[PDB]
Symmetry: D2
Subunit: 116 residues, 4 copies
Amino acid sequence: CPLMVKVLDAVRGSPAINVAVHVFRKAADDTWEPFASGKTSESGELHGLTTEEEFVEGIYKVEIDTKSYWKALGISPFHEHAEVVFTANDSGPRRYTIAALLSPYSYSTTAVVTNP
Amino acid sequence: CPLMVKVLDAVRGSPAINVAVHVFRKAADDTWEPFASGKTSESGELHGLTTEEEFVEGIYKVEIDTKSYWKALGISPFHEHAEVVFTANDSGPRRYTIAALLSPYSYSTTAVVTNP
Amino acid sequence: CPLMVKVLDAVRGSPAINVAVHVFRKAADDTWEPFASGKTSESGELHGLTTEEEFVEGIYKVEIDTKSYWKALGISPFHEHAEVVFTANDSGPRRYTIAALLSPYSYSTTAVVTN
Amino acid sequence: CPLMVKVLDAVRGSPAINVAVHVFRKAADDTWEPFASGKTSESGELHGLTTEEEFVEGIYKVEIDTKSYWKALGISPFHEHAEVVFTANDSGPRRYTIAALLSPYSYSTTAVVTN
Ligand SMILES: *S(=O)(=O)c1ccc(Br)c(-c2nnc(-c3cc(Cl)c(O)c(Cl)c3)o2)c1
Ligand SMILES: *S(=O)(=O)c1ccc(Br)c(-c2nnc(-c3cc(Cl)c(O)c(Cl)c3)o2)c1
């Protein structure tokens, strides 16, 4: 439960289902290492990406594959993806929810950070 | 469960707790009649505003008392409130989630509409 | 011009053109009195709503007719309109830009208040 | 000018001034090559990044240094930066404005693409 991604569709007023999500972690050599990936469910949510053991301090990138999502609805969108880059767990473990609200030429993203 | 309001704080990265919410319904004489009210919980959510029986077709206004919320954090915000005005249930009963993401000089709002 | 309204379309990536905008001022009896109105230009902007003399401190509402905008594009929208309610304050900066970014089931709004 | 970046501050209701912005172009080997950079002006805008000749079709990334912006205001932010990745397309309108509205734990971004 340390990392959860929630994606909403501003055109339809619905969860954004079947959205691919790739998570990377910056390595010591400054490259982005693949960390976890998955797809949003029918609720627009992606659970089970990581564990509290594996989710150590670091800089993480959550790539939400918005272009692929829109094309499949018949919309040719602006962005390639929405990327969310953040330092995690640097004051000890936290739980992160990364949310995104998608439109064809815009998105909004926020984080809800809680201390267990 | 027909109407739920969720409020998030973009400054803190947290639910917006203890936010007053007033719901009105437009009457036949074109006035706004008080319909329901409540406060967001520690999760940022307000449940139990209405019932499927009472929540008939109509034009509804959800007033989120953002100014009061910000002042209590020591911030003098721009808006008096965030108002969300919509026609509900005009193709039969639906479930509505009204979400708002608040900043001192801005907000975003969306709806998730589902058919039970 | 102390008040300008800017409206953007998040579906097409464009200004929102020919959107009706109505401004109201709260009266002493708590009713909303018509104050100014117009339609957004080809740039998505509505200028010339008021003057410095007329735009006194008080509570104002800007109503943006989003439903009609979407209907004309053939897209079913959620909201009847977008509403922005705020207090004008003499102690703050003097020019108010109310911006709105529209989608069918969501909108975002901000204020840019400058000198 | 085919590309402009505009940055707004949702906490203060103002342009976001002196924000570093870096633009990259995706190379054939999938690396990001520096393309242009600058700092936002007192209006929150960054003009003059590129020319029509240089801004050929391809994938571009605009990185906005939000963390430094918030740190200078004393506010602890969530993101390292805001990122906007898009394809430039000759068949669409010719002028791209990338706008971002910043909060400490959230941002919104849009594109206004016009002729
Ligand atoms: S809650 O259960 O966590 C919950 C319930 C419903 C919703 Br719709 C949400 C939620 N999470 N994020 C957002 C959101 C993100 C952005 Cl970027 C935005 O602009 C808006 Cl208006 C909402 O809603 C949470
Ligand atoms: S116009 O000259 O282009 C113009 C004038 C004033 C403003 Br404030 C803007 C503008 N550009 N983008 C935005 C904006 C972006 C987002 Cl992501 C957002 O959520 C909102 Cl509410 C506004 O405003 C353009």
